[PDB]
Design an enzyme around this catalytic site. Structure first.
Site, mmCIF file in Angstrom:
data_model
loop_
_atom_site.group_PDB
_atom_site.id
_atom_site.type_symbol
_atom_site.label_atom_id
_atom_site.label_comp_id
_atom_site.label_asym_id
_atom_site.label_seq_id
_atom_site.Cartn_x
_atom_site.Cartn_y
_atom_site.Cartn_z
ATOM 1 N N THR A 162 -22.173 -35.456 -34.559
ATOM 2 C CA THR A 162 -23.369 -35.327 -33.746
ATOM 3 C C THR A 162 -24.588 -35.065 -34.614
ATOM 4 O OG1 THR A 162 -24.376 -34.198 -31.842
ATOM 5 C CG2 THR A 162 -23.045 -32.859 -33.337
ATOM 6 N N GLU A 163 -25.744 -35.467 -34.098
ATOM 7 C CA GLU A 163 -27.000 -35.161 -34.761
ATOM 8 C C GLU A 163 -27.303 -33.674 -34.638
ATOM 9 O OE1 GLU A 163 -29.883 -37.698 -32.963
ATOM 10 O OE2 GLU A 163 -29.284 -39.479 -34.098
ATOM 11 N N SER A 164 -28.012 -33.146 -35.632
ATOM 12 C CA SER A 164 -28.376 -31.730 -35.617
ATOM 13 C C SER A 164 -29.718 -31.587 -36.334
ATOM 14 C CB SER A 164 -27.297 -30.888 -36.277
ATOM 15 O OG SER A 164 -26.964 -31.414 -37.547
ATOM 16 N N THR A 165 -30.800 -31.710 -35.568
ATOM 17 C CA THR A 165 -32.144 -31.647 -36.122
ATOM 18 C C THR A 165 -33.057 -30.663 -35.410
ATOM 19 O OG1 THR A 165 -34.099 -32.958 -36.708
ATOM 20 C CG2 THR A 165 -32.955 -33.527 -34.669
ATOM 21 N N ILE A 178 -27.374 -29.810 -27.988
ATOM 22 C CA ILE A 178 -26.215 -30.063 -28.838
ATOM 23 C C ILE A 178 -25.086 -29.100 -28.497
ATOM 24 C CG2 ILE A 178 -25.426 -30.214 -31.222
ATOM 25 C CD1 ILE A 178 -28.557 -30.667 -31.824
#
Lengths: 273, 126, 171, 162
Positions: free
Chosen positions: D2-5, D160
């Site tokens: 997963t993206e984590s920004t 998220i």
């Protein structure tokens, strides 16, 4: 050996009783020229062959190169030795070492071009150097490319408007200063324009003939209706059938089928049939 | 064609009056005085005050009476105008130096009175 | 050197200046378009000392512009053959010397003087140095040099300076 | 993998209030767009605001790429929100009745109007920015009055986590 003597050139005498006499060439022949040089302070007229002569020039005159690696370049000499002659070019300040025989006296101006080319139909460019089979073109990269002859030509927008960092209007042939970018500090002149780029020229800059590109904001100033059959559905010409010859956002030129007239009709009164 | 050794000038310059360095300075600073007096007028490019500071930091004379005196003694003796300007602007120290500057000064004037007139101008330089 | 001679110029005045400030506009136009110009015959002009007269303004047939012949006195300055000219010296590169006498791009090469004068890069300010290191030719000092050459470069002059004659150094 | 920004309604209401206050004062806004999703979200939110308040001063969008994005968003209704799918039978919401094509923003005509700039700089925005600087309402909202309204396109930390 070879002899190439042209009228008006300055030649000297290297051997004999008439040594150190400088004259101007009037004519030339093949091997035994029997030349006629116009010597200084001498009205009596002499004769000299080709082997006795040598192309000696006075200091501070316009010289050209007839053959060799330095051909096609002009300049002014500094001092003529026995055989070592130096000159500085008109384009760059590089010292050129030429033989005294390979110099001629000419008054023509040095050449030292810059038309708009199209590498691909989305990119424009300006050629920096004329070569025999290729074009050296500096595009909006800062990198000089090497492409073949068969680029296309695009119509230059001489009335285009560009904006600097101060949001001031600039146009063609305007001197602008570079205050930002990889080459801040230089100064250029506008030749061609883009949406966010400007072409620059500096005569003191010696790389690629003075051509360069800078961004616009990093500087500072120093119809479908055509050909369609329509019906006039409103007005005095109502019911007339015609073909649109020319049209704008408001009016249209309708070529009436029944008459010999072409009339201007408002496009709100036209129905495409 | 043109040369200083034979004093060959273009034919139109028979009345070409030549101004000394401090004369150029006083005219140029008078031009700036009038330009500062002239309101709503743009200033000139770098060439004017470039020449002005060249006439400032290389000025040989400082008072107009010195220029008047050197001119008033120099027209009496037979000098060319270009020769007069060269002698009054080169500022020599010795007589043989004055001969060795310009070839047109070779044999024009006697050496002892040339030394005398350099003594006079060296007394009136500041 | 600075002369003071008579020059000639032609002024094309637009009809919009045909008012009470006509002659003043002619002087302003002359001051605008004679400054910063050089020619191969009458030399580089310095400034207009005075204007002698404004000629009769001939109206050109077919154009609104009026042509005004102007006679005026201007200071000129050009290189001369066989003359010693005061100069200004600036920083020195590894090849040559940058000298500026007003607008003059006068240059000194290695084929104009004997080898009594040299240049070294060891000193932090670059300058011309002899073996004895007595005379120093660096930025912003007073020298004398002789020019013989002259060239035209589109209202620019390219010339060569010489240092063959003695006592051509600092005061 | 997963993206984590790494609120929204309040930001949208504030942006709409700024746009409405600037257009009701007679001035013209020059809000730029750089992404396609942000451009389409701004156009649809604007269009429902203009239809709701029922004022007829125009809104315009430019370039030959935002029009292609508009056509492709029109052709892909099932990949959109619940409202666009449900009210599609009434009307296609991406067939804008107020946002029209900008022929150089109607040749930069005077009056209150909304203009979408092609980049978010680059061409087709700096000319408008220089032509409208020092005006009555020069409201330009980056993501000479300058406003700051930013719309998040990605998920935050809590999204998220969820």
């Amino acid at each position: 050996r070879e002899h190439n003597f042209q009228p008006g050139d300055n030649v000297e005498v290297c051997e004999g009783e008439l040594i150190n006499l400088q004259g101007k060439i009037l004519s030339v022949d093949g091997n035994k020229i029997t030349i006629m040089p116009k010597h200084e302070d001498l009205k009596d007229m002499l004769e000299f062959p080709a082997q006795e002569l040598r192309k000696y020039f006075k200091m501070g005159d316009h010289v050209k190169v007839i053959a060799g690696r330095f051909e096609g370049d002009t300049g002014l000499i500094v001092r003529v030795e026995e055989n070592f002659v130096i000159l500085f070019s008109d384009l760059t300040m590089h010292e050129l070492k030429v033989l005294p025989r390979d110099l001629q006296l000419c008054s023509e101006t040095a050449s030292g071009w810059g038309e708009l080319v199209q590498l691909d139909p989305q990119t424009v460019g300006v050629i920096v150097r004329l070569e025999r089979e290729t074009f050296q073109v500096l595009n909006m990269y800062g990198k000089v490319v090497t492409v073949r002859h068969q680029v296309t030509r695009k119509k230059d927008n001489r009335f285009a408007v560009a904006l600097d960092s101060e949001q001031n209007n600039i146009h063609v042939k305007d001197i602008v200063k570079v205050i930002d970018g990889p080459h801040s500090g230089r100064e250029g002149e506008i030749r061609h324009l883009f949406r966010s780029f400007a072409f620059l020229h500096c005569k003191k800059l010696v790389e690629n003939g003075g051509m360069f590109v800078c961004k616009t904001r990093h500087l500072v100033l120093a119809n479908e209706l055509i050909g369609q059959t329509v019906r006039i559905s409103q007005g005095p010409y109502k019911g007339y059938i015609g073909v649109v010859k020319d049209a704008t956002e408001s009016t249209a030129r309708v070529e009436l089928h029944s008459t010999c007239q072409t009339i201007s009709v408002d496009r709100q009164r036209l129905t495409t049939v | 064609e043109e040369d200083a050794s034979q004093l060959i000038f273009p034919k139109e310059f028979e009345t070409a009056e030549t101004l000394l360095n401090s004369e150029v300075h006083m005219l140029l600073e008078h031009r700036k005085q009038q330009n500062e007096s002239a309101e709503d007028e743009q200033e000139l490019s770098e060439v004017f005050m470039k020449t002005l500071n060249y006439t400032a930091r290389f000025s040989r004379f400082k008072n107009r009476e010195t220029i008047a005196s050197v001119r008033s003694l120099l027209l009496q003796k037979k000098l060319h105008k270009f020769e007069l300007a060269c002698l009054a602007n080169l500022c020599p120290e010795t007589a043989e130096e004055s001969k060795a500057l310009i070839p047109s000064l070779e044999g024009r004037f006697e050496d002892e009175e040339l030394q005398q007139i350099l003594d006079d101008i060296q007394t009136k330089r500041s | 050197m600075f002369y003071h001679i008579s020059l000639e110029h032609e002024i094309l005045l637009h009809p919009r200046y045909f008012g009470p400030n006509l002659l003043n506009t002619v002087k302003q136009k002359l001051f605008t378009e004679v400054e910063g110009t050089c020619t191969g015959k009458y030399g580089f002009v310095i400034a207009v000392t005075t204007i002698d007269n404004i000629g009769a303004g001939v109206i050109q047939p077919g154009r609104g512009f009026v042509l005004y012949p102007v006679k005026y006195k201007a200071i000129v300055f050009r290189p001369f053959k066989g003359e010693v000219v005061d100069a200004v010296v600036t920083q020195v590169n590894k090849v040559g010397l940058f000298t500026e006498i007003g607008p003059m791009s006068c240059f000194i090469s290695r084929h104009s003087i004997p080898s009594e004068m040299e240049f070294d890069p060891n000193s932090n300010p670059p300058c011309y140095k002899t073996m004895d290191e007595d005379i120093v030719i660096q930025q912003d000092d007073e020298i004398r040099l002789k020019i013989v050459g002259t060239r035209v470069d589109k209202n620019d002059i390219f010339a060569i300076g010489s240092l063959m004659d003695d006592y051509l150094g600092l005061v | 993998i997963t993206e984590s920004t790494y609120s929204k309604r309040c930001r949208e209401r504030d942006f709409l209030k700024k746009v409405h206050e600037t257009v009701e004062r007679g001035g013209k806004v020059l809000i730029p767009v750089f992404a396609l999703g942000r451009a389409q979200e701004l156009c649809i939110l604007l269009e429902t605001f203009w239809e709701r308040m029922n004022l007829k001063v125009p809104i315009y969008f430019s370039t030959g790429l935002t029009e292609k994005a508009n056509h492709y968003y029109k052709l892909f209704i099932p990949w959109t929100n619940q409202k666009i799918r449900k009210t599609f039978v009434q009307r296609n919401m991406f067939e804008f009745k107020h946002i029209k094509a900008f022929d150089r923003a109607f040749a930069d005509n005077p009056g209150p109007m909304v203009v979408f700039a092609t980049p978010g700089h680059a061409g087709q925005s700096l000319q408008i920015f220089r032509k409208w600087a020092g005006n009555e309402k020069n409201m330009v909202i980056m993501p000479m009055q300058v406003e700051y309204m930013s719309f998040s396109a990605h998920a935050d930390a809590k999204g998220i986590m969820q």
